[PDB]
Amino acid sequence: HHWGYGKHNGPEHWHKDFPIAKGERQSPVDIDTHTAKYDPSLKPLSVSYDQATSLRILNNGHAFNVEFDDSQDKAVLKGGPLDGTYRLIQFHFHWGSLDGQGSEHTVDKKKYAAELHLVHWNTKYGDFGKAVQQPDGLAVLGIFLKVGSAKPGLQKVVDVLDSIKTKGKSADFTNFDPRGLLPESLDYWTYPGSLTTPPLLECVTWIVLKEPISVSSEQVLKFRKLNFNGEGEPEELMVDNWRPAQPLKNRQIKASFK
Numbered sequence: 298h299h300w301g302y303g304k305h306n307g308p309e310h311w312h313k314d315f316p317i318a319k320g321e322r323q324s325p326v327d328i329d330t331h332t333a334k335y336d337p338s339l340k341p342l343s344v345s346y347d348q349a350t351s352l353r354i355l356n357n358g359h360a361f362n363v364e365f366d367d368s369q370d371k372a373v374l375k376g377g378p379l380d381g382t383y384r385l386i387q388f389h390f391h392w393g394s395l396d397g398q399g400s401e402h403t404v405d406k407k408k409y410a411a412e413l414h415l416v417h418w419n420t421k422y423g424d425f426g427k428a429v430q431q432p433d434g435l436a437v438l439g440i441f442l443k444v445g446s447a448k449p450g451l452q453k454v455v456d457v458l459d460s461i462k463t464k465g466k467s468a469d470f471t472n473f474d475p476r477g478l479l480p481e482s483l484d485y486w487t488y489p490g491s492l493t494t495p496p497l498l499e500c501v502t503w504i505v506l507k508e509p510i511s512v513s514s515e516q517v518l519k520f521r522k523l524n525f526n527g528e529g530e531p532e533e534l535m536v537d538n539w540r541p542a543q544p545l546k547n548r549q550i551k552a553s554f555k
């Protein structure tokens with residue numbers, strides 16, 4: 298009886314196995330745009346994905362992860378609110394059963410259809426596994442998805458999903474350029490938080506872009522054709538794999554803009 302996305306194993310149960318679920322810097326949160334503080338000390342975000350080596354795509358039974366070679370100083374996030382350099386290791390999404398829900402962060406209580414998380418670890422801790430044990434170990438660039446026009450740079454991802462339908466399946470996935478997922482503006486909000494999945498470790502600097510990307514109905518419908526269950530197991534569509542907004546507690550959300 299392990300964690301997932303349902304009534305008896307979903308977010309409201311996670312605290313029993315992972316008591317940090319009720320901690321002081323949990324994610325996601327609602328982003329109140331009027332109260333977020335413009336911080337003129339914040340720097341432009343530096344996203345350098347010119348050398349990203351994608352390797353493989355994995356259905357891990359909660360979502361799908363696009364994986365990158367993180368053994369060289371290839372794809373890096375820096376600047377913004379960050380000190381030092383963070384290396385891209387993977388991305389994944391959270392999405393809904395319906396277009397009106399799916400995001401983890403919300404903006405003045407607005408839910409988006411989905412949310413992309415580009416996960417990076419701080420190079421000063423040597424790898425991802427040591428980084429998650431530190432309060433400044435990870436940086437996640439979050440980008441909202443709305444349903445409208447297709448995202449041409451997303452299509453290569455959508456077209457491989459039929460090959461990873463069920464938990465534990467993987468496929469080779471080389472030469473994918475994550476730059477084709479970045480909205481036009483890098484204006485952002487930032488705050489200290491956590492992983493949104495167990496183990497819920499409080500190691501993340503969140504950087505949430507204000508500008509969503511558009512994806513088509515057809516693209517998100519293909520996300521919704523995944524299963525939570527294993528092969529040869531009864532079908533559980535991979536949908537509503539999002540954690541609701543958590544208490545802000547003693548935190549400030551800062552804005553890079555306006």
Ligand SMILES: CCc1cnc(SCC(=O)c2ccc(Cl)c(S(N)(=O)=O)c2)nc1
Binds near residue numbers: 359362416429493494
């Ligand atoms: C630490 C052991 C660990 C971390 N995550 C998972 S599943 C979700 C996932 O791969 C993941 C990994 C990192 C981050 Cl930062 C986030 S999220 N959703 O907070 O972006 C999700 N399983 C085990």
Ligand SMILES: [Zn+2]
Binds near residue numbers: 389391
């Ligand atoms: Zn995530």
